[PDB]
Amino acid sequence: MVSVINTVDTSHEDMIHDAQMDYYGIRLATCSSDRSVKIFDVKNGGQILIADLRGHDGPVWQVAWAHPMYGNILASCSYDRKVIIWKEENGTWEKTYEYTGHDSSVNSVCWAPHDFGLVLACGSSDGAISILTFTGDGPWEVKKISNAHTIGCNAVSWAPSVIPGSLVDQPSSQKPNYIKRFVSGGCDNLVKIWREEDGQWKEDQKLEAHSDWVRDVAWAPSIGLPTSTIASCSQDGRVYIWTSDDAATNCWTPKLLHKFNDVVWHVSWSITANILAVSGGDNKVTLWKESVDGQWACISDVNKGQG
Amino acid sequence: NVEMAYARQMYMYNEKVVSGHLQPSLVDLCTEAAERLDDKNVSDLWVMVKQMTDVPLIPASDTLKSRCSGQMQMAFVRQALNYLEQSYKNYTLISVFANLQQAQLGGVPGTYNLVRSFLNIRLPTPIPGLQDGEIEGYPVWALIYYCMRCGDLMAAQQVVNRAQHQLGDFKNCFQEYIHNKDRRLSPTTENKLRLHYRRAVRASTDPYKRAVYCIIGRCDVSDNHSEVADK
Amino acid sequence: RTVGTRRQQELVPLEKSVTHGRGSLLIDMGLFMGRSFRVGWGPNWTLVHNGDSPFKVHMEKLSLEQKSRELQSYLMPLEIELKNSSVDRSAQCPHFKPNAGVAAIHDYAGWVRNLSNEAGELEAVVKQWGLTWTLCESLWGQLKELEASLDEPNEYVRNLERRKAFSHWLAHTAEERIEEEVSLYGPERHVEAVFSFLTGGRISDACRLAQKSGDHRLSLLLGSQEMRELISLQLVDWNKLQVDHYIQEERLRVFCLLSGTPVWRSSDNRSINVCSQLDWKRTLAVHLWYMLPPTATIAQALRLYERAFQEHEEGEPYACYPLPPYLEDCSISLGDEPSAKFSSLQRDVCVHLLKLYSERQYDLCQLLDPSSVTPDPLDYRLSWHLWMVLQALNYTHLSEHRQGTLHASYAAQLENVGLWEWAIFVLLHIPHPHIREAGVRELLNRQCVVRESPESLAKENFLIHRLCVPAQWVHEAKAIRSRRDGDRHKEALYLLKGHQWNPCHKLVTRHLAADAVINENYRYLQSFLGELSNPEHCKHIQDWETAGKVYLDYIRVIDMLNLIQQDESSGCELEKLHTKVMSLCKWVELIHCYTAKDRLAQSEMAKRVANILRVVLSLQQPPESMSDSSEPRVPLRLLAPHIGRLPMPEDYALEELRGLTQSYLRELICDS
User: Fold this and answer.
1) Could you count the other beta carbons within 10 Å of the beta carbon of residue C285?
2) Cα C523 to chain centroid, rounded
3) Whether A158 contacts A113, CB under 8 Å
4) For residues A10 and C72, is the Cβ–Cβ distance under 8 A?
5) Which chain B residues are within 8 Å of C398, Cβ to Cβ?
6) d(CA C561, CA C616)
7) What is the DSSP string of C106-118?
8) Of which family is this protein a member (chain B)?
9) Cα separation values, A36 from A55, A111, A277, Å
10) Mapping DSSP to helix (H, G, I), strand (E, B) and coil, where does residue A162 land?
11) Handedness of CA A145, A150, A153, A155 (dihedral sign)
12) Any C CB within 8 A of A48 CB
């Protein structure tokens, strides 16, 4: 589909479970069953391993870049029940924090919108979700949601930063009390929405449409529309698009995107075009876009091996 | 845009009325306008309006006397039950098609098999205390209840006929209930069913059995049966 | 050795079912589910994937594979659009709204009447858009017609004049493919080439063609009344009497065209269809000229033509279905299933526009589907400029969500190519002020550049002096752009022309002040601290008092000292230098260098300052030429008290304090 670009020999010894570009698209973080997190500085072509970060005792499942306003920070989560925060200072990568407050595998990590501060959500196979907060002064603060999912949490995704009433006149200097939300998917077949109220996290909604384990959840970035959109995928081979047209009604409507013949592993939103990337057990990556009639169409099918 | 879509229907309605043509159904014109707005809640609202307005229109001089007549009140409750039964049958269908691997729908069409496949989703673990046995591994009273909740009394009668040796006199009461146009027992059969309910069924550990007897026997109207009627 | 085995680096071919029943065990699924890939796409169309000597993962760019290069053309159109743009300035998020519903149809029709000068080379990349925009000009033109009215408009004249303009459009849409046809139908056929000449008139030359083989019938006729109705009655009568059982083959189709019937079940039981072998466009034109009076309206022409491809309870559907100008080739074979398929087909714009002429209710959510014009569900182009013209021609039934989506998609496209400020103009029309504000700030923080260049400065001057954007916001974006990666150099400068009533101070102090003292670069520090020292900025800066005073004073003292001394060493400034310096002793006393370098720099500065002070006092309190060599009999208690409260390392600072104490002891001995 797209013209062929650089090939990166990662020198790995196993399957890369997940990969994320940094905010400016100058670096690629990758993580594997080999227990390493590898960072590549692929600027203007030129594949370049710049760090091999070792600190996990098991397979690393997900990596998340923080917003560059806090410097070059990377989170990783693993089967070893740990979340590690890596920071680059003067071109040296170091472990700056380690969180061990989960009793089972930590399957997903997601940084909050930078407007909320330096906040990390972590979903675990112990069924809990932990919110790690860095205030600039002292240790990381931890708010743990115990029994968030009955069997295990597989995925976490933050809601976009929305200022309530952004079309209402306000003073030049003021603090915008953001509604902090995130979505989680679990092994109880539920997609759950969470809200911060009075410094505590509460379950705001349960979304029931999957018939087997929710594998991934992705909150669509705000494109300046009032409609909030979430994608979820599951072991049942379904992908759902959840829409909420009014933030006051909290009414979420599921629309079936597609049903694959195999498991769907990950869902990811394009920042600018509301395009959903869907990764299946069939070793395909499909791209989906909503048409003007509200129908979802597959706009590309990317097979392993056509590069 | 919504108000303009309806104002066009009011114009088209009034134009036909003024020209002395057959009066179009304002419900159908407004339903066709609602379907064009792509709002599901408004579409579901007009489907409900259409179902509840499909009653025998009596040209009464007095709308109050017509509305308060026992025949008209019974027609509204029949249409409300039909709406809720069709809505729940569609919910059961969508829930089964969303969970095909767990539901095990099989290849035989019909409400009986749809309800069995729905029970694999709603009752994945055997509930202790269910009574009068199982048909093909599914609880008899749960099958009867969800067939009735889908409005398919013939699918429920198929369950009752398969479990006839466990259900006893209930089969005869249920056959009388189906053959009545108003889904009513005779006062004699109803009083027999109510007496049986108070003596034996009220203390049953099976919540589906209790609910099915309370529906057919129109009794224990204080019980909400929240174990089986959660919405 | 030095050879190797040879690593099999395949993500294994296709073992599956074993591990699969193994996982059918539901006791664990997180390992089952390690195998595949949790990979998603990122911004600027950066695609991340894990799919395929080596064997591992490829990561191949994926922007737009269709129409990647096509600049010049949009440049002309977009310029035209924004030159026709209008500007609102009441909130810190400005608001664009098209100029009131006028001139855009003549801007677009004028623009394609320039692309026609070089459109020859392009094949099917403009004719579709040309058909649509010239249809929009014919229908809701609603523009100049050489004064269509020089004096006053009568709706009959206004509608007849629109039928002239749309008849000239229809003739021009047919004129090319008709001279292809007239090159092929060789000598001759008055039952074919005569028909095609009539499907696009130009009757002027249709007469010279009758000359050769055309009949009298046609040279005589080359506007009546029901004259043609009596032709019709004559036909009815042959019919009731079987008078036309033997007659010319499609000459009957031509005769029925002169008399509008226009589908005829003959006494042979033949369905003599006049309309077949045409497109819906010519089929509706045949209804507008030959089936109907020479005076009528278009909504009625449209609804009769729709109830002509739509069937009847006695009749074959006799008009062609209005397919888009591409899909025509694959007319779906309607095998016993026509309607259920029609309830899924797009219909090209021109009929949605001819309705919106007629009426105000039909769905803008169908009319703006970009696979009408093309079929790549990506680029809209036509959709955005058509939405601006539809907003100029009133019409407000479109949902806000679909506005936000259409603006987000065209802004995402513009970038896909890699564009800039006209995307800001398109966003400046969104009615939601904080979403207009947030989208423009986020897009600036993606794409703005901390190498300043003629291309950056062109986009920046366009943003400020055309789109009304600011100077400090771009600099703030550059500051973000540095912190996340570098540096120490441009970030300070870009933050400079950006108030940091707190952060600015923070940063400057903990870094630039220590290095500028080591290198003594007071000047470059003197701007930021001078600008922060304003009487309104001093009110708002945390720690302002403290540090402001501190550094400002260091630099000032040095300068004043030197200059004045030389100059002529005037007394009063010297009083105010004394006043500043005597207080500054008791301020250097309190430095809270909470960190290392903090203390590093503190020491550095104390040292340098002390050196400078020594040198300056050198010629300070008046060399006593008249006294027995300027003996310092006078002793200041305040200097000794300030030294005690002065805070620095116990080594060098206390050694200096001990030297001062020895000097004080010598002064006491002199007093004795």
Assistant:
1) 23
2) 43
3) yes
4) no
5) 1
6) 7
7) HHHHHHHHHHTTT
8) Belongs to the nucleoporin interacting component (NIC) family.
9) 8, 20, 25
10) coil
11) negative
12) no
**Residues of chain B found within 8 Å of residue C399, distances taken between Cβ atoms:** 1
The pair of three-digit structure tokens given for residue C166, joined into one six-digit string: 């749309």
Which H or E element spans position A133? strand A129-134
- Are C514 and C600 within 8 A, CB to CB? yes
The residue to which tokens 């698009």 are assigned: A241
Query: Searching chain C, which residue's CA lies closest to the CA of residue B36?
Result: C363
Q: With beta carbons less than 8 A apart as the criterion, state whether A55 and A36 touch.
A: no
Structure tokens at A241: 């698009």
A211 in C contact zone (CB under 8 Å): no
**CA angle, A147 as apex, A144 and A152 as ends, to 5°?**
105
- Cα dihedral sign for C162, C167, C168, C170? positive
From residue C524, how far is each of A222, C527, C553, C600 by CA, in Å? 42, 6, 15, 21
The two structure tokens encoding residue C406: 């259409």
Q: Where are the alpha helices (DSSP H) in B57-185?
A: 63-67, 70-98, 100-103, 111-122, 140-149, 153-162, 164-167, 170-179
A250 at C interface, C-beta within 8 A:
no
CA distances from A79 to A83, A113, A140, A178, A183 (A): 10, 26, 21, 33, 21
Phi/psi of residue A111, each to 5°? -75, 140
Give the closest residue to A55 by CA, choosing from A92, A99, A15, A7.
A99
Resolution in angstroms for this experimental structure?
A: 5.6
- Output helix, strand, coil percentages for chain A, rounded to the nearest 5: 0, 50, 50
Length of chain A: 307
What is the spatial distance between Cα C40 and Cα C223, in angstroms, rounded to a whole number? Answer: 68
> Of C585, C531, C538, which Cα lies nearest the Cα of C557?
C585
Residues comprising chain B, all counted: 231
Characterise A77 by phi-psi region: left (phi > 0), alpha (psi -120 to 50), beta (else).
Answer: beta
Strand partners, A229: A243
Question: Long-range contacts made by residues C513-521, C-beta under 8 angstroms, separation at least 24?
Answer: C513/C551, C513/C601, C514/C597, C514/C600, C514/C601, C514/C604, C514/C605, C517/C554, C517/C601, C517/C604, C517/C605, C517/C608, C518/C604, C520/C608
Question: Which of C77, C185, C202, C204 minimizes the C-alpha distance to C129?
Answer: C77
- The reply to whether residue C62 touches residue A187, judged by beta carbons under 8 angstroms, is no
Q: Distance between CA atoms of B90 and C645, rounded to whole angstroms?
A: 85
